[PDB]
């Protein structure tokens, strides 16, 4: 066959990662597919760990990932992160998030999973 959708290009994967990390920091919970959740978790953890020092280099490095959401805009989301989310976790070595499996979806029988983060 010939004409075909662009599909899951690497840019699509990375941009989905960015959108989901923005969404999880903004609200604190995500209800997504499991096999996107296990892939979002890595970037989530790396950001929160990179964000405990608060120098301007860390602000630049985190600006490379976040996107604005309905709750917070990006320059509001950065402050919201570095003020309350990042320091809360400052003493935990790893393990900043959990992915728990929901029930299968009616549309596709995909394995819905919830991504969240608590102490």
């Amino acid at each position: 066959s010939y004409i075909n959708k662009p599909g899951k290009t690497s840019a699509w994967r990375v941009m989905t990662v960015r959108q989901q990390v923005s969404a999880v920091l903004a609200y604190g919970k995500i209800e997504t597919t499991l096999k996107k959740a296990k892939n979002t978790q890595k970037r989530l953890d790396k950001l929160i760990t990179l964000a405990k020092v608060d120098n301007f280099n860390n602000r630049r490095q985190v600006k490379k990932w976040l996107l604005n959401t309905n709750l917070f805009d990006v320059d509001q989301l950065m402050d919201h992160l570095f003020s309350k989310v990042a320091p809360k976790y400052e003493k935990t070595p790893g393990g900043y998030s959990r992915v728990l499996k929901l029930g299968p979806r009616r549309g596709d029988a995909t394995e819905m999973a919830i991504l969240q983060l608590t102490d």
């Binding site: 029930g103 919830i114 969240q116």
Partner: protein, 56 residues
């Protein structure tokens, strides 16, 4: 490529032997009673003694 001879009602039934379904594993959530499929969160939104969701 086509069949040369119709596959009877005997050969067809034999092929579908492996089509049977499996009964999925079931657990009973503590913190309420119900049969959630094992290793998930029931509709309580409680997984074990931890809360991960809303009422239903």
């Amino acid at each position: 490529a086509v069949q040369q001879r119709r596959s009877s009602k005997h050969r067809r039934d034999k092929r579908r032997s492996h089509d049977a379904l499996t009964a999925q594993a079931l657990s009973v959530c503590q913190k309420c009673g119900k049969k959630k499929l094992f290793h998930r969160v029931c509709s309580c939104g409680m997984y074990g003694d931890l809360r991960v969701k809303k009422a239903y």
